[PDB]
Amino acid sequence: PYKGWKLYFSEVYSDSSPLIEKIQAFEKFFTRHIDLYDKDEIERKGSILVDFKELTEGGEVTNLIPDIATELRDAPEKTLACMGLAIHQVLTKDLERHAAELQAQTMVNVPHIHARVYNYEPLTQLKNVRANYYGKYIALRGTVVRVSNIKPLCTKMAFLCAACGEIQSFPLPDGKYSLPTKCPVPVCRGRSFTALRSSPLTVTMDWQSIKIQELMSDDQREAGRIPRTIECELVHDLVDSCVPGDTVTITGIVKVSNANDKCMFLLYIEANSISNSK
Ligand SMILES: [Zn+2]
Numbered sequence: 115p116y117k118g119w120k121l122y123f124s125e126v127y128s129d130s131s132p133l134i135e136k137i138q139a140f141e142k143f144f145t146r147h148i149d150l151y152d153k154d155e156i157e158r159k160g161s162i163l164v165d166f167k168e169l170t171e172g173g174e175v176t177n178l179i180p181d182i183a184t185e186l187r188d189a190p191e192k193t194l195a196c197m198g199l200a201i202h203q204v205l206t207k208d209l210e211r212h213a214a215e216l217q218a219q220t221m222v223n224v225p226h227i228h229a230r231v232y233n234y235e236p237l238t239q240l241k242n243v244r245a246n247y248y249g250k251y252i253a254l255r256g257t258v259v260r261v262s263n264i265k266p267l268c269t270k271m272a273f274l275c276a277a278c279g280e281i282q283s284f285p286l287p288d289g290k291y292s293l294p295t296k297c298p299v300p301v302c303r304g305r306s307f308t309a310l311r312s313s314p315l316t317v318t319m320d321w322q323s324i325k326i327q328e329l330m331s332d333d334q335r336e337a338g339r340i341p342r343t344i345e346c347e348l349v350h351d352l353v354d355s356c357v358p359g360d361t362v363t364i365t366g367i368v369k370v371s372n373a374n375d376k377c378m379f380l381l382y383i384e385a386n387s388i389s390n391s392k
Contacts, residue, residue: 117206120283120315121226122199126298133196136185139178140200143168146175148204159351161228162201163387166235186231190251190367194386198229226317228350232387234365240328240342243381247368254383258360259343260325264353267321272313277304283315288372322348324356326364326383345371345382356390363389 116137119127147168156162169182176182186193202224209222238252268291270283275297284294284307296303310316323345330341346364348355356362365387371380 116199116203118199118202118224118226120281121202122195124283124285124298126300135178136193136196137200137203140197141203142178143175144201144204148208153205153208156201156227157205157224160225161230161351164197164229164231166231166233169231186234187251188249190386191249194229194231197231198227201229202227230352230387232363232365232389234387240326240344241339243342243344243368245379245381248370248381250368251365251386252368252383253363253365254326254344254346255361255363256326256328256344258324258356258358258362259327261356261358262323264320264322266318267349268316268318269349270315270317272310272315273307274310275299275302275304276306276308277302281310281313281315282307283317319350320353322353324348326362329361345380346385346388347382348385348388352385352388355388360390360392362391 116127123133125131125133151162169176169179169186182193205227206222206224209224210220213220213222234251234253236253237255238247240254240256243252268286268289270285271291272281273284273294274281277297278299278301280297280299282294282298284292286292294307296305297307325343326346327341327343330336330339346366364383364385366383366385368381369384371382373380
């Protein structure tokens with residue numbers, strides 16, 4: 115009933131899991147506001163931009179998401195996955211109905227849709243970003259200083275279990291090729307999988323790394339303070355959205371980087387959205 119379930123979740127689909135409640139919550143939101151977005155631009159770019167003020171809007175459309183501000187902040191990777199599958203389920207239902215009338219007068223293949231929330235608040239200044247912010251969703255605003263070149267990045271790798279024939283979409287931590295340890299089905303644990311590099315469950319998107327420097331008051335906050343910087347990882351439609359010197363607003367997830375000048379603990383922002391003025 116959920117085509118594209120493995121495009122967002124590595125778990126096995128079960129109607130008893132708490133994910134169903136969250137997914138259907140955004141599904142009600144996206145069905146009522148489907149005319150507010152361009153369904154053609156969503157499918158082409160593979161993403162959707164949602165205003166955070168629309169989600170925190172009081173009323174009837176946001177009836178099933180009263181705690182979106184806390185869940186997105188403390189569990190962004192789980193909230194965006196449900197929000198992404200929801201819009202994918204809304205689009206796959208709106209297109210299967212369109213293809214139903216064409217047949218009378220049904221394989222609709224909707225690709226992965228990145229759920230991208232912008233205009234998130236409160237804004238977090240870079241100096242107050244501590245190590246405790248790991249896994250949290252925040253919004254930054256700084257100057258672009260460096261923009262690396264675009265490179266491919268294998269985010270997920272499909273694996274076929276030789277026991278039951280199930281194909282899982284296994285994420286790679288840092289693009290490092292790794293193998294699953296157990297089959298996600300609750301019956302068998304084959305522990306032996308074959309890589310399906312040509313499978314659609316194997317994700318490969320354009321990757322770009324940019325560096326952001328905080329907005330420093332050149333005289334007020336210059337009383338012995340150095341401008342802090344942080345790396346931001348753009349992907350897919352966010353790639354090539356800013357040049358060095360631009361002032362951008364970035365939302366995303368704080369994560370730990372894994373790659374005298376060598377410090378062994380660096381935080382970066384997995385960019386979920388970027389807004390460039392110029
Ligand atoms: Zn299996």
